[PDB]
């Protein structure tokens, strides 16, 4: 990971439903969105918010170094956002409802001189996982068994 | 640099505010001073330090009023090969042979 200014992410979450520390009880409220180790804000529904940021990253609105992990204990719930500068990541291909996304029609485009790796991550088919977002995934090994 | 800003001397009247920084092209002045650009094959063959000068302007504050900024070089800085700041960036195949 390279780096990004912190303040742009702080403003971006506040309009998306983050209820700040002034209001929190907190427990048991299914809460505690973190940001680089700092605790800021609370959101009500976990399943609404953790899909919302990932769907926005695979559209192109937010910048490309943001990755959301969820923690699903029987009594505890945390939502993690990571935006520091020294993590180690790994590339995977998004699958969706059984079909591997962006089949052959792009692969001749990669084979030709049209597009490249700079274009595939903007188009939302390659995803960079941390060690922490990769906890929620379930990864295949071959295109045969999906 | 923007952590420090104005600090001291001991006289209460004069203070110095720090300005901006620019980084020049890799060059080197010997004795009988003469500035020419370095080229990294030459800088690994006669024990030099492939480096760039660090220019920094300062703000003379006379009782509040800022009136004339002077750029003084502070020192040198080593520079990474085939980075964006050295002389080999984006440079084509028939010239790296050169």
């Amino acid at each position: 990971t390279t780096g990004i200014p912190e303040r742009e992410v702080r403003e971006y979450l506040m309009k998306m439903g983050v209820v700040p520390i002034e209001e929190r009880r907190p427990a048991p409220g299914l809460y505690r969105v973190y940001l680089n180790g700092v605790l800021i804000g609370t959101v009500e529904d976990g399943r609404k918010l953790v899909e919302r940021i990932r769907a926005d990253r695979r559209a192109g609105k937010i910048s490309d170094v943001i990755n959301v992990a969820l923690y699903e204990d029987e009594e505890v719930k945390e939502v993690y956002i990571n935006s520091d500068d020294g993590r180690v990541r790994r590339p995977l291909i998004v699958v969706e409802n059984g079909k591997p996304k962006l089949t052959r029609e792009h692969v001749e485009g990669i084979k030709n001189g049209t597009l490249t790796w700079s274009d595939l991550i903007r188009m939302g088919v390659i995803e960079y996982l941390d060690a922490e977002e990769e906890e929620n995934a379930y990864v295949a090994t071959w295109p045969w068994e999906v | 640099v923007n952590e420090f800003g104005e600090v001291v001397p001991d006289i209460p009247n004069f203070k110095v505010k720090f300005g901006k920084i620019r980084i020049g092209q890799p060059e080197f002045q010997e004795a009988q001073g003469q500035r020419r650009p370095l080229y990294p094959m030459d800088a690994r063959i006669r024990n030099l330090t492939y480096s760039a000068p660090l220019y920094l302007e300062m703000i003379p504050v006379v009782n509040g009023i800022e009136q004339e900024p002077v750029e003084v070089r502070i020192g040198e800085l080593p520079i990474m090969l085939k980075s964006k700041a050295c002389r080999l960036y984006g440079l084509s195949d028939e010239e790296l042979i050169k």
């Binding site: 990769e134 906890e135 995934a137 379930y138 990864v139 295949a140 090994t141 | -």
Partner: protein, 900 residues
Amino acid sequence: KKVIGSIEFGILSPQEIRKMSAAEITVPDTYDDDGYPIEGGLMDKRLGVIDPGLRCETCGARAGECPGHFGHIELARPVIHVGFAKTIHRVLESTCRECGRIKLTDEEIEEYMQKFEVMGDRKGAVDKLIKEIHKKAKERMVCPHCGAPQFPIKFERPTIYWELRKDEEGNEYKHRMMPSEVRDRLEKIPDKDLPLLGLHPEKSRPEWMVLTVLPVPPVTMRPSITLESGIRAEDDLTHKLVDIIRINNRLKSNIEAGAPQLIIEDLWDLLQYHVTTYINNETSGVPPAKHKSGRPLKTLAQRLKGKEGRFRGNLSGKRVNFSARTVISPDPMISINEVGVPLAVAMELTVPEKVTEFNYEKLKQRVLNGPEKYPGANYVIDPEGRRIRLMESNRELIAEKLDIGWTVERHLEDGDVVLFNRQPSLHRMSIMAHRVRVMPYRTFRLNLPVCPPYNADFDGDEMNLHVPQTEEAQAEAKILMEVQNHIISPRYGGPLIAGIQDHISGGYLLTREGAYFTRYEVEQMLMFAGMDVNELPEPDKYENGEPLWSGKTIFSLLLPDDLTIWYRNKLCDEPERCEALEKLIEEKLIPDPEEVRKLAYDGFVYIQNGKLLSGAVDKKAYGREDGKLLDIIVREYGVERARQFLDQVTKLTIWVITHKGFTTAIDDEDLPQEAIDRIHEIIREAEEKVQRLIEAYKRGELEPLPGKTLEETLESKIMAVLAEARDNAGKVAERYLGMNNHAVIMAKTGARGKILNITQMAAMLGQQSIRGKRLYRGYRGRVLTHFKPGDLGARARGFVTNSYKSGLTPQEYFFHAMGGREGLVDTAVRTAQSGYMQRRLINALQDLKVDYDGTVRDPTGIIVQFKYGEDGVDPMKSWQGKTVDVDRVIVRTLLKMRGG
């Protein structure tokens, strides 16, 4: 020409420091600067020479043969020595002040005079006696001679002292003790009290512990290191001693003119502090006096010690002369006790030779020939002592009358005893005097059977030899240290220098049933394996095809003429057909070698009268572990016979393995189709049994073990199922593939193989554990991110199921790297713990000898064990713990007598 009898220790009196010292140093200056390093102080003020100037204390004494001399410093203030300070504290709190007594009753005076002569021998028992005297003198405040004169309570921790005295009624002010106040008290103790402590009245006075005069170490202990060409790096001892004198100089002036009385006491402690680092820099509560660049000073306590100091680093272990060090490379054509020497190393190592009367024709030629052609000399020596190097421009004038008595140094030749070494020097036997033979290339050569003592292999290792020179130290190496004296080992009796990889599996191909050699192949190999026999290979036992021999009778030329041995070895797969052979033998002691004995097997070795009638030679007749045919030839027919039994076996066996072929291609690991489907039905139901046992834990049908908890019972049961599955499939492959490929011949007999890694190459690889646990480190409830979480199945928690032929899939390969890195950490960890554990046991036990009446005694004369080692047989020559071995003796002696 005397020798040192005994060394007696003590303390230097300050009177004796002045008489020993030759000069007082008063100039705090070293050089000042970069020219004329001469002062009236610390340099050569008739103190010690390090330069080529002859000025010393009237005695000439150039830098070669100049003992350095001591200087002294008249310290203006008394100074506590560092090492005594814990034991000065024992004296001060156990004495009645102002008079000098001991704070004891008259009973203990007359009792502890008498207790000294009773315990006058052992060190450890009298050391506890001196602690209880410190105990009884503490808890008394009333002396019998001064009427309890208000004893103050002493104090310590770490070096500054105090007292708890009362002034008005009950005050507890901490009066600081002065060093001048202490030494005045110590002079009032009479000398008769020194036997009541652990002190001596002529060698250790207690008032001499306070440094009034500091001695200066000599010049010869303080060299001047030059940095580039003329700049002198000041020595670490020099740099602090200069700074001591400059803090003295001001202090002298301070008390001679200044009188504020306050800075003095502040300055007082600086003097103490500054010499305290000079004794030991690494004390506690003291900032390390650094060199003014970021390096600490290695002072006296760091010079004495520190894992490379001057007991082990330089005194009892030194760097040597007349050595070499290169790489090694095999050859099985020299004898067991020879060695190759490269011809460059042979001309740069020399022995002294001392020409007497009968080598005078030899060494005239060795000095006439120069130091170029290989028989040559380097340094000749006259009886005066002036050596004459030979190299320059003529030797004829030195090859004149050579004058019997001279000493010539010549190159090594064929015959001069060398040593050898491996360097990790673990046990007794990794240094062994060989017998130089000179061959042109650049590697030390080494006979293949002598490579389990050195624990070496030939992937570029390093062996070092070093020639011994004087004629007394050379005949000790040849008689006591040659290779053939070390054929059996003192750890278990069994032979150590024996056969290895090809010598075993070649010897199986010679004694198989069906090994018929033709006439040309017999005659060729008897010339190659050293032996010399005439035209008696007779009598052409099977002329059916052609006149050709058997394999037993070529092996039955190497044995002496009256052996009789019978034993069972590793290849026995049918114990009944050995039995029958054994039964006849035990009742009819000498049957006929023709008739009944051709009912033989290939797993019952039987030799009689030097003729192997029935058997098959494997790793029970040689070998790094027990072989009882080299064993019974060193206890019955000297030693010098068994160096030529092992020298003729080795070359005979490698001949037949060369000209018969022992390849191993890829089809040797292969199993046919129906045997593979036998394996896959094992792996299916064994995974199903795992899936059932998880369901018993999940629904509450625990069936618990008494020791472990429910989580730990589950893991226990599972591994046993997995183990059994891998062992059951190992039996399938072993049953199928025959003993006729060249991959089980290496495994049954035994030469770099097991029967594990030939069924771990066409079957499972078992489970894959890490120090007893099953693989658990990873994500939150799942090892790799390819497995559904909350899973304890066999396939999902470290269990591979493919061979090294049928390909590892990437979860199984990544499970195998986890089990592989656990093996590599425990090589470098375990070696360093055994090395420090050996140093304890050698250094505690290296004193013990065995006297003539059979008694092991310590250095003090206390008998440790009567009649050495539960009397009395040497473990090098005892048999398997026992003694004289009557059983073998009876059978052997009877047979020889009866047989005749």
